[PDB]
Amino acid sequence: LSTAILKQKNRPNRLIVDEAINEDNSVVSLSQPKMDELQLFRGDTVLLKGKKRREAVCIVLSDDTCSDEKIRMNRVVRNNLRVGLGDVISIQPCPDVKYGKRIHVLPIDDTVEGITGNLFEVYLKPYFLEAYRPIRKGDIFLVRGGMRAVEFKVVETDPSPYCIVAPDTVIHCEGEPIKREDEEESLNEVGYDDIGGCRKQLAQIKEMVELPLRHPALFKAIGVKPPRGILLYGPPGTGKTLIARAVANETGAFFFLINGPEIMSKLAGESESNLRKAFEEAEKNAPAIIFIDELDAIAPKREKTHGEVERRIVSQLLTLMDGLKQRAHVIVMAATNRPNSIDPALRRFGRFDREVDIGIPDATGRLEILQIHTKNMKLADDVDLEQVANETHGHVGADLAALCSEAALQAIRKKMDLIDLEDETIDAEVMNSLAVTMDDFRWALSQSNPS
């Protein structure tokens, strides 16, 4: 009912991802009735939109084994769109694409140990020659070169974000090998899928933050000013910083983070300077979101705070908040676990006049969180997350994350005598057999703690 904004809605170009028959990195497959519906001729360059603001440029072909409302794509495309089989994507016509001037690609380190020879000659030139490949900045793609397969990252493009790779296109692969951990910490990046039992609130955040920035026309047309300060509150560990990260990674808006302790750690004046620099930066760049994490650090009750610099900072913030005129298109978000210790002046009309309660999850919410946490964990058949969800009454998201960590440590302990602290590497068999059992969860449960 209120949750209406979160609903996906069926569109002509909103398609479910299926596994590819054509395993080329540049190709996506559609049924023939769907291509006619979208006015897409064979071999047209297309723009695909995934999760977490991710994109890929592909060339579209007709497939008969494919269903009407499905799209076929390999792992390389699915990775670049940060999607798994079954997820929905947008498909857009893309006749805009310029021919490429200069591109800069680099190999992922762990897929490139032993023999350089020439990376352009062995791998890249046979991959691109006469292929007229569409590529996007930040694409990770795989190329076989007889012997084995090397993954490459598109670092730069001379036509703005995406281009077609023609014979003209100078292919550079100059610098050091791109680190594996960097790109794995990039897949790590928090999206809305990584936040559990918070549906009602994510709906509220998209209403108050995402909707007025992307569509200011709506609010201006109806005759209403968009609320400009949203304050997330709730007990420690409920998911506020997580939502902050999600929003940062999910929004069309420019995002600026301010950490409370990070500001208060600075020299007198140099902190007030960074607060100003934040707001000037947000004003300068697009529709924008300013996220003040741990607000109570910077803005406690002026009445009960000893230092002059500390009182000056709260005043600096209040001024900035009223300093944005309507036409700035800047929303300030803030998170706290002690809302009652914030200066009431900041919670007045026009400032942080809207509150989102990120409270304690219910039994249903906890199950989501457990499913989110264990999505990379090796679990046994006998693990019942429904059972764990019910036995975890007072638990919030942080408590559940800890529970899963201790369940895993227990499984490591059960494998201890086949492991020693002294040897350089752990045995390969021991690594594979590692599964977290329900027994492990019950041991974690017996140790667990509220609030």
Next chain:
Amino acid sequence: LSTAILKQKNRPNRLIVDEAINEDNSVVSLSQPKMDELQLFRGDTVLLKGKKRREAVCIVLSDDTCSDEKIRMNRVVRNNLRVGLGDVISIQPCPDVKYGKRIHVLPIDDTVEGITGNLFEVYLKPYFLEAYRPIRKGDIFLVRGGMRAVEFKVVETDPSPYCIVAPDTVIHCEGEPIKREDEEESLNEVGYDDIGGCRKQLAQIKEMVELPLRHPALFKAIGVKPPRGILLYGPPGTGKTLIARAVANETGAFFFLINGPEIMSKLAGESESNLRKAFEEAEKNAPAIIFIDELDAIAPKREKTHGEVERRIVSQLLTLMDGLKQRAHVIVMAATNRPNSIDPALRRFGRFDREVDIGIPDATGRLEILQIHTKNMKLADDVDLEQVANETHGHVGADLAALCSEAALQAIRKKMDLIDLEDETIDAEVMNSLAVTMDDFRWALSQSNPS
């Protein structure tokens, strides 16, 4: 059952130390079936691992009076490995060893009074010539030179940590004699063997600190992030600082110590600078442990603390704690005796989210502590430590150490009339007859005090 991590595990190369028949400083003996099992030819340079991260480089020879699962080595090697007869050691092949360029040795002061002549000519040259001795940095070795025996320390080596001493190797013995007290305070250095009634907690520390740094692959494979802030707490004098010292000496990780009062003693800003320098240093150096001792000195509850500089430090620490990304491989340990006075922000998820209670010892634990303290004391037959353990209901390790000191002072008092405060030296006979009796302990017990 949980304690599984502490268990030693039998290995082909894990051997018991027996007394040597071959009394050379460079030589270790093994049975012939064991040499074949480890693929060790006669006269191969080997690396031995002892207690408290200590090592020796030896040359291996076959012995027939030696058992299969035993190793023979003299006092000098045992000293260098900080092991006594019966302790287990690792043995490793070592064919890496370069020929030495320059070494720097120095004599131990008390073993060098009267006649210099030439230390290199009389002692060192005949010890090394055509012998191709393996030596490690930090080795203390004894050499006879007709008249008497002088102990020398290896201060420096031009091939990194260890080298072979060939005729090529320039032998320097330039500087001042190394002080006896320096090397006895180096034998003094704390290891896990010096910490009593803390088995459960030592196992926890190895799980949360040692395991994820030496084997990050386990936690990454199972799909779990390693906890990154461990907080030791308990009453005054239970052994927190003692464990701190033990870990520092026992770990494969680079270790950085921060003392609370040592930071708070510094000028405004220059304290925040050392904190950053500590974290930047730990990040720069390997897998690392940062130990913040007496954390309550640096991080009290921001709500109830007067100084602006004092509030700024807590903020500085929080920022550093969060500043470490997962892939830093740095664990922060901290100790306190008033956990309830630390800012709660620091005890949240991702910060100091794990706790180890170093509590009051039980009757069994007290016995361990008394055995650890008295290992260098001269005791009598009638001294029953089990009796003393039972009569010490409220006592913690610090109280037990003090109890032992006062028992010993009593034994000195019993010997008083044969001693006087005015004479330059104490009589030789009086020194040897000094034993701490049971009666002394009952006197110590009558004086003792709780908490």
